[PDB]
Amino acid sequence: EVQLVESGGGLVKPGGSLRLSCAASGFTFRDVWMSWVRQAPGKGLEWVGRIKSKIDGGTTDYAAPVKGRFTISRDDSKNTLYLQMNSLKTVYYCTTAGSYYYDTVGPELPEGKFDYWGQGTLVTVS
Amino acid sequence: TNLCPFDEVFNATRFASVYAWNRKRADYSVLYNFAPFFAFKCYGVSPTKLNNVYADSFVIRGNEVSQIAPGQTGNIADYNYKLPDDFTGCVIAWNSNKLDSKVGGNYNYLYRLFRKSNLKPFERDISTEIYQAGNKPCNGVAGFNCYFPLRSYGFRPTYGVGHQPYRVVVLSFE
Amino acid sequence: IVMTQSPDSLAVSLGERATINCKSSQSVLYAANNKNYLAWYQQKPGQPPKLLMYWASERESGVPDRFSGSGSGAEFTLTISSLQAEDVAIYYCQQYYSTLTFGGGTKVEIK
Ligand SMILES: *[C@@H]1O[C@H](CO)[C@@H](O)[C@H](O)[C@H]1NC(C)=O
């Protein structure tokens, strides 16, 4: 069974630096182009960026509004998606959305859902 | 102990399309042993005798595996991949629906339908030219005879073995 | 590539047709593949979102036929045949041709 959750949010004074993480299991993490999206309280999801698969170069993309301050990385031992934050400015959702169309994965699926969506962690800024 | 990109070519994480067939330059038993096949016997050569080399990797449809043969005439043969009648090479295909097919189909895979010059053998035309020349080129798709050279086959598990996907590596030993 | 949903907030009653139009700045349809690069996600309040359709036409497995989509060029649409109690969620049309751009987001609710 697949599950996607995140943890580590909290209140922080602007100007600091920290990192955020997500938890994944039950699926082939390496092949998929997992990415991270954020949803401001009362707003919509804004594409923070995509971290591509290592076979496809591992290229990292970011959106212009958050360009130059954020960084999305990957690890295999923990099956964990990361979103470090630098120069904080006044809910985050790890995902595998938008990946099935580029990654190389067969038709076999853990249940039949090729999407994977995080629990959602709220991060508040002072 | 000898290493070749043949394992990389065959077990490629992503294969190339037919219109742009990925081209790379001993022991070849691993090629025929690793997967059961629908068609692997060499057309123009002997299966046992194979063991300059051009490994032309792409995916082709099951009914079109026979189309990749010396002197054969058809859609894949005329335009996508034309082979010289006096060529010594083997076509090797295995049903890889588990690997390269996708829920909803894998549409990254393409082939070249028609090039007006009947394609010379071992010649690749990558250009996205809209169908060539004619009485009125018009440079744009607003009528007949001006088609984009590319079309894609979906690759689904429910597809029949004839329409199921085969990773053919048309290796032409020279 | 700027992505815009129609509208920012949609209201649909139980079981009625729920059409959500999408419009993009550039052209998403790939000339070679002859199909678009689009997706559709629904987000229930408080827990993970989910994927309705992919390739702007193909259907997620495990969810019946009421989900329906059809897109071409830079204009896309996802239409829902019937809205159920669990179907109530907030939606995000997505493109993946170059980068990925979730739009402003369309939230649907029972009338
Ligand atoms: C070749 O690919 C198949 C399926 O992806 C699998 O056996 C493995 O990833 C590869 N083979 C080896 C020996 O690594």
Author numbering:
A (entry chain E): 1 to 90, 95 to 130
B (entry chain G): 333 to 357, 363 to 388, 394 to 516
C (entry chain F): 2 to 112
Sentences copied from the publication:
Evusheld combines tixagevimab plus cilgavimab, which are derived from the progenitor monoclonal antibodies COV2-2196 and COV2-2130, respectively. COV2-2130 is a class 3 RBD-targeting antibody that blocks interaction between the RBD and human angiotensin-converting enzyme (ACE2) without competing with antibodies targeting the class 1 site on the RBD. We sought to redesign and renew the efficacy of COV2-2130 against Omicron BA.1 and BA.1.1 strains while maintaining efficacy against the dominant Delta variant.
Thus, we sought to optimize COV2-2130 to restore potent neutralization of escape variants by introducing a small number of mutations in the paratope, then computationally assessing improvement to binding affinity. We considered 25 paratope residues for mutation, primarily in or near the heavy (H) or light (L) chain complementarity determining regions (CDRs), H2, H3, L1 and L2, and allowed up to 9 amino acid substitutions per mutant sequence, resulting in a search space containing over 1017 possible mutant sequences. In our top antibody design, 2130-1-0114-112, four substitutions accommodate Omicron escape mutations in BA.1 and BA.1.1 without sacrificing potency against Delta. This engineered antibody is thermostable; potently neutralizes Omicron BA.2, BA.4, BA.5 and BA.5.5; and restores prophylactic efficacy in vivo. The distributed nature of the improvements in 2130-1-0114-112, with four mutations spanning three CDRs, plausibly makes this antibody comparatively robust to subsequent escape, insofar as DMS results demonstrate an improvement in binding over the parental COV2-2130 where escape substitutions present in the design targets, BA.1 and BA.1.1, are mitigated without new vulnerabilities. 2130-1-0114-112 does not mitigate the reliance of the parental COV2-2130 antibody on the RBD residue K444 and sensitivity to substitutions at this position. Although our top candidate does not neutralize the BQ.1.1 and XBB variants, which contain multiple substitutions within the COV2-2130 epitope, DMS results indicate that 2130-1-0114-112 reduces the impact of some of the mutations of the variants. Our top-performing antibody restores in vivo efficacy and achieves potent and broad neutralization of many SARS-CoV-2 VOCs by substituting just four amino acids into a parental antibody that has been extensively tested for safety, manufacturability and clinical efficacy. Deep mutational scanning of tens of thousands of pseudovirus variants reveals that 2130-1-0114-112 improves broad potency without increasing escape liabilities. A subset of these designed antibodies display enhancements over the parental COV2-2130 antibody, including superior binding, broad and potent neutralization, and in vivo protection against Omicron BA.1.1.
